[PDB]
Each structure stands twice: as structure tokens, then as C-alpha cells.
Amino acid sequence: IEEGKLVIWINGDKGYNGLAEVGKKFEKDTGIKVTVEHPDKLEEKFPQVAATGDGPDIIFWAHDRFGGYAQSGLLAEITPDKAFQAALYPFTWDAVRYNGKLIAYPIAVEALSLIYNKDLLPNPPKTWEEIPALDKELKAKGKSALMFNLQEPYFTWPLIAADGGYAFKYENGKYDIKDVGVDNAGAKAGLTFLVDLIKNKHMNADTDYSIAEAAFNKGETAMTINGPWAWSNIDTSKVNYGVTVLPTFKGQPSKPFVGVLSAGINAASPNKELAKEFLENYLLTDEGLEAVNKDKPLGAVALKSYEEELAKDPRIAATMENAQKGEIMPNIPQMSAFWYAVRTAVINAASGRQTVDEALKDAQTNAAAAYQNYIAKSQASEAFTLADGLKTTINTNLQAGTCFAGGATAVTAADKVSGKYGDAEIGGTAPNCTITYTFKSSGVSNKLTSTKIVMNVSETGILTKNSGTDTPVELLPQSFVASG
């Protein structure tokens, strides 16, 4: 990570061009260049690159992923003065609190709404159950009732939760991480309704974000389900749209998981004070939020002064009505595993590859498998932590003409280093020095036990994959694997 610069990652559906304008302003006032990027699969790429000490200075995502990042030591604890904290709503700070510590800046509150074409559908349905017959009628005029992103469980969750689906049971001030709530009658009823929509040819299992967006914005489908960020592209389209409450299911509201768009600081960033000043004094201002919101709407913003104006928008009022019917997502480390499990179940049921019963029955197991991989990847990141220390040791004693000591050709104890999950030591000969990290035979993931990561050290300190590595390739940072 470059010192004296700011690299920002934010998802491609957000107002990153508007964010870059706030960036350019910061660059004018400070001389600090700000670069805004939007990598695909950003929320999965960041933990990998941050593990090797690289990545963005600042990462934006909904708050649900941040407990996982914090747990893996990837986030800097944030430190705003109480005067600043008073500028944002209290419940938004709560969303970014993990283990007592604030782990990000809250930016905006997002919930899914029902978006409808007022010309096709002046009076949109209040119930999911009306939608099949509505589609049949619209098909006669060459239109469809509803299209939305079926590939991400975020979009199907409001229906799954309506009759009783839940992520983790909340009992006695804690989440029960072993009580996952998609293997119950309520979840099954919601997913069954969805699968029948596909079986009855009212929806296609392959519909994704782009397909649904293009169909709604071109007037081919009467309704879609999406968040505030989507409104901008509809604004530029011919469509006259309305934003309203999600349909009910079995007389109960759809319950979208509510996300707080948040900005965290990379633990490995050399630019932490700069990141803080950008976020506190440029982004989280009326002018800063407006710049982004003008690009792609944020929803209901955490900043009280600017949300004062936004709240008069009927679209934000619907956003907040849906948010209240739903629930704020947990931020616990198991959230990404939960999301992997629900994505898999929904897709397996959608495609017809598994029954709704079988798909949902496998979810907790699938979540566990995902979480075990997450733990192993986190533990493996220690090798790059230890190697970074050892790599400076390597360059300081290369002066003695060797990879070690003040001249030895065996590793001194000053060339070894102990870790929590394994030990690293310098190796090699001549100017081609290596670092080897060996996992313990127990007390670490059984995916990792007794395996080793072997790194070649360039003269410039860049670590590449040596073929002696037998730590599983899929648990290593992809950039490291690529160098192999």
C-alpha cells in the first residue's frame, strides 16, 4: 500500500464516480491523490489482499462483512471524537460496533423496496400471491410482472424471511451461531413460492442483476426489487417508476435484511490519519454525501444534517418503511458463511437440482464448511505477517554476505520466529533467500496442520510462491498463488 496516497474500494453498483469527485476535492486541498476502484467480488478480494498487507486504504461494504474482517485483524479501530459521533444516528454506530470497538464509519442505511412501472401497473400488488396471475395477464401483452436478481440471496431473503426464515437466532443478548433459521417451515414456504414462480414460467432461474435491471428499465417487466442505488439508472430511462412496500407473504410483510453501507480502514494502511480526515471531513459532510448520492442514491444516510433533506423523498420513506419491516443484519464473523449457504440453497432449489427441503436442510452444514475455510484462510495469513518481519531481517544480514547471522550458513535463532499457528524461518543460499512458514501439527485447522508455505524473497522484498509450498492453494491469497 502506497504511502501519501489513498486507494478506495467500493462496489460497482454504488456512486463511485461521485465518490471520486470527493476524492478530487481532497486532492486539491491536501495534494493527496485519491483513487477509487470497484473490483468485482470486492468483498471476497479484500480479505485476501489485506492478508498480504496490500489492498485499499479504505473499503466500503454493508456492515455485515466487517465483523469477519475485524476478527481476522484486517481493520483499524476507528477513533472519532464524540463531537463527530453525535453527527450520525446512534443505531448506525451500533451497526459498526464489534466486540466493544468501532470498526468502521457508517455511511447510509439500505433496504430493498418494490419498484414498479406506473404506466404498466398504476396499482401494484400488495401480496406475493397475486403475482403469478398478474404475470399471466401481462404475458398476453408481451410483458412480465416481476424480474429481480435471483443469483444473490440478498434479493430473495425478504420472501424467505416473511413467514419465519431467520439467519441466526438471537437469544440472551447473543447470536446462537448453531441455530440457523432456514431449515424451518417458514423459510421452506417462501422458497417454495419462489421455486413455483420459476416452474410456472413467471421467472427464469438464470435472471441476474443486469438482466432484471435492463428488463425493468426498458419497460419489459412491470416490477423489480432493488435498492436505492438502482434509482439513478431508472431516472435516465423512459420509465415512470414508483418505490413502495414489498409484497406480503401469507399476510406477513417481506422482511429485507437491512444493511448499513460502511467504510473501514485497512489495518495495513500507512495512510490511516489521511483516511480518517477524508472520511470525517470530506465524505461525511452535506456536500460529500450529496456528491455520491447524485451519482447513485445512498438511501437514508447516517449523517443527521443531510438525512434531514433526504427524508422528504417518498422513495426514501418507502426504503425506511421496508427497513422497519425487516431486520438489521448481524455483523458476526459467520455472516459470509451464512450468505454462502443461502446462495447455494436458493440456486440448488431454483435450478431444480434439489428439493426445497433438501436444499434448506443442507444449509447449516454448508455454512459450517464455508466458515471452516474462512478460519483456515485467516490463520494462514500469519505466514505473511511473520514473513514481513523476516524479510527485513534478510536484507539487514545480506550485508554480512549471507542469508543469515553475521555470516553463518546455518539459520541462527535470530533468523527464526514463532507464531500462534506455526513458525517461520529464513532459508536458501546466495542472494536467493527463502522464508518458510510451517504450521503446527495441531491447534490449527486440519486443512493446514503440518503444511508449509515457502516463499522466495526478491531483492526488493516481494514474496513469491516457492514450489515447496504444500499448504492448500485455495486457502492462500490468490495473488501469492498466481506468483507461483
Ligand X SMILES: OC[C@H]1O[C@H](O[C@H]2[C@H](O)[C@@H](O)[C@@H](O)O[C@@H]2CO)[C@H](O)[C@@H](O)[C@@H]1O
List interacting residues with ligand X (CB under 6 A).
Answer: 11, 13, 43, 62, 64-65, 110, 152-154, 259, 339
CB-based burial label for 368 (10 Å; 0-12, 13-18, 19+) = middle
The window from 119-127, 255-263, 342-350, 389-397 that contacts Mg ion (CB under 5 A) reads 119-127
Half-sphere exposure of 400 (CA within 13 A, CB side): 13
Q: Which of Mg ion, ligand X, none has residue 371 at its interface (CB below 5 to 8 Å by kind)?
A: none
Query: Please, which residue, 108 or 356, has the CB nearer to Mg ion?
Result: 356
CA distance 472 to 484: 13
Q: Which of ligand X, Mg ion, none has residue 162 at its interface (CB below 5 to 8 Å by kind)?
A: none
Q: What angle do CA 475, 481, 484 make, to 5 degrees?
A: 145
Under the binding rule (CB under 5 A), the answer on residue 273 touching Mg ion is: no
CB of 164 to ligand X, least distance (A): 20
CB of 124 to ligand X, least distance (A): 22
Rounded to 5 degrees, φ, ψ at 223 are -145, 155
Under the binding rule (CB under 5 A), the answer on residue 119 touching Mg ion is: yes
- Contacts for 337 with CB less than 8 Å, ≥ 6 apart: 367, 368, 370, 371, 374
Half-sphere exposure of 362 (CA within 13 A, CB side): 19
Q: Which of Mg ion, ligand X, none has residue 339 at its interface (CB below 5 to 8 Å by kind)?
A: ligand X
Query: Please, which residue, 355 or 478, has the CB nearer to Mg ion?
Result: 355
Structure-block grid coordinates of residue 366: 454448508
Rounded to 5 degrees, φ, ψ at 457 are -110, 120
**Number of residues near Mg ion (by CB under 5 A):** 1
Q: Which of ligand X, Mg ion, none has residue 344 at its interface (CB below 5 to 8 Å by kind)?
A: none
CB of 461 to ligand X, least distance (A): 34
At residue 17, what is the residue type? N
DSSP strands (E only) in 17-164: 33-37, 58-62, 97-98, 101-102, 105-110, 113-117, 144-146
Structure-block grid coordinates of residue 4: 501519501
The window from 112-120, 176-184, 314-322, 342-350 that contacts Mg ion (CB under 5 A) reads 112-120
Query: Please, which residue, 15 or 125, has the CB nearer to ligand X?
Result: 15
Query: Please, which residue, 228 or 428, has the CB nearer to ligand X?
Result: 228
Q: Which of ligand X, Mg ion, none has residue 64 at its interface (CB below 5 to 8 Å by kind)?
A: ligand X
Q: Which of Mg ion, ligand X, none has residue 154 at its interface (CB below 5 to 8 Å by kind)?
A: ligand X
Chain discontinuities in the chain, listed by preceding residue (C to N exceeding 2.5 Å): none
Query: Please, which residue, 13 or 183, has the CB nearer to ligand X?
Result: 13
Structure-block grid coordinates of residue 145: 410482472
Under the binding rule (CB under 5 A), the answer on residue 357 touching Mg ion is: no
Q: What angle do CA 361, 254, 242 make, to 5 degrees?
A: 140
Q: Which of Mg ion, ligand X, none has residue 65 at its interface (CB below 5 to 8 Å by kind)?
A: ligand X
Residue 243 pairs in a beta bridge with 115
CB of 142 to Mg ion, least distance (A): 18
CB of 69 to ligand X, least distance (A): 11
CA distance 421 to 444: 6
- Contacts for 86 with CB less than 8 Å, ≥ 6 apart: none
CB of 119 to Mg ion, least distance (A): 5
Q: Which of ligand X, Mg ion, none has residue 362 at its interface (CB below 5 to 8 Å by kind)?
A: none
CB of 270 to Mg ion, least distance (A): 55
Query: Please, which residue, 258 or 453, has the CB nearer to ligand X?
Result: 258
CB of 339 to ligand X, least distance (A): 4
Structure-block grid coordinates of residue 246: 414489498
Q: Which of ligand X, Mg ion, none has residue 119 at its interface (CB below 5 to 8 Å by kind)?
A: Mg ion
Query: Please, which residue, 120 or 167, has the CB nearer to ligand X?
Result: 167
Query: Please, which residue, 13 or 321, has the CB nearer to ligand X?
Result: 13
Query: Please, which residue, 77 or 119, has the CB nearer to Mg ion?
Result: 119
Q: Which of ligand X, Mg ion, none has residue 454 at its interface (CB below 5 to 8 Å by kind)?
A: none
The window from 81-89, 111-119, 358-366, 383-391 that contacts Mg ion (CB under 5 A) reads 111-119
Query: Please, which residue, 259 or 427, has the CB nearer to ligand X?
Result: 259
Burial 439-477 (b: 16+ CB within 10 A, else e): beeeebbebbeebbbbbbbeeeeebebbeebebeeebbb
What angle do helix axes 16-30 and 286-295 make, rounded to 10 degrees? 140
Query: Please, which residue, 53 or 219, has the CB nearer to Mg ion?
Result: 219
Q: In whole angstroms, how far apart are CA 460 and each of 271, 275, 282, 318, 426?
A: 21, 27, 36, 55, 16
Q: Report which residue's Cβ sits closest to Mg ion.
A: 119
Q: Which of Mg ion, ligand X, none has residue 135 at its interface (CB below 5 to 8 Å by kind)?
A: none
Instruction: Name residue, grid cell 417451515.
Output: 185
CB of 168 to ligand X, least distance (A): 14
The binding site for Mg ion (CB under 5 A) comprises 119
